[PDB]
Amino acid sequence: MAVYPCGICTNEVNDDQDAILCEASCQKWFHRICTGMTETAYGLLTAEASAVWGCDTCMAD
């Protein structure tokens, strides 16, 4: 049973997978691939200490 089920696919978000936390609101983890986020966007968001990401559902709210 998943500890951090992906907000999109519901499969476990493992530490060795590209994945991002919806810090904007819902606090679920999301696989990078599931979100449609590029490798470059993922590296950028990682490097931006002051940036947080929100999932499509949370951003739409």
Binding site: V13, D15, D16, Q17, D18, A19, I20, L21, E23, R32, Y42, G43, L45, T46, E48, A51, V52, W53
Partner: peptide, 7 residues
């Protein structure tokens, strides 16, 4: 942002 790449 908090990712799995986060140090």
């Amino acid at each position: 942002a908090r990712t799995k790449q986060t140090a």
